[PDB]
Amino acid sequence: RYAVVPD
């Protein structure tokens, strides 16, 4: 997954 902020 790309450009997904860490939780």
Added chain:
Amino acid sequence: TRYSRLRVIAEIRHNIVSSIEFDRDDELFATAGVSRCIKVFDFSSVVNEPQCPIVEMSTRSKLSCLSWNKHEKNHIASSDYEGIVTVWDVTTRQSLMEYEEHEKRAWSVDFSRTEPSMLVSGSDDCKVKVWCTRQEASVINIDMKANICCVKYNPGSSNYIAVGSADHHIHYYDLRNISQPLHVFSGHKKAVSYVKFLSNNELASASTDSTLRLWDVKDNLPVRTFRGHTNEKNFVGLTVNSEYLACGSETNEVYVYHKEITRPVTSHRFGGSYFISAVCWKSDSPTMLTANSQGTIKVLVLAA
């Protein structure tokens, strides 16, 4: 009253663009993202013509962020999904430095404005690393407790950095004494994905709590919370100048806020479930670069 809309003055039709940034003179801009290609464009050509980058540099991994050097016209840094922080020369296409200490993806890189050979990165490895272009090894390392989404130098002094953390806080460090941050700003309810300075004393942040926030780093105070956009998941971009904040949205819309007003001044639908992925003001002007998850680039301008 001053502005009510964003006009499209140019569009480069298209992969996620993670970063779009102007060079030191706002003459060139660069894009980079999942396609593993740092592209440099001439701004005036883009505005005036009916296309092609003037430089294309291929990389080994997807890029998360770009930062142009504030003194060396031709130098630009990148962070990538392998954790590598690279300094490039866009004229020779050389990788000048390849910094490989991070053990996980690096989400950000930032060249200091006032000590321009210094650059800082942050990573999912929970480390902040400060680098100097004349040295192969990191100069400063801060071991933090959570993934780091963004690190930004204060525009007036290379001694201060803001760190946007997955722990929901902004950690503001004086690099001369890293034992404790100067201050930790709480208020966001989810990871802090971006931190950007409006001025020496004014710091903005974005978070996947669907807010932007404004903070006072002189007196360590919360100032304001901005709402209207949708940002629960992605890196959607944050850019600020002396008066305005702009950010992306998972609705494929760009939002603009004036720093004194909590609800948007205006917004623009980019034209599926696309998200805006990168934004950058042209300094303190009403002109902005924007890009989305389809790879489309638009030059927008605030207008009456």
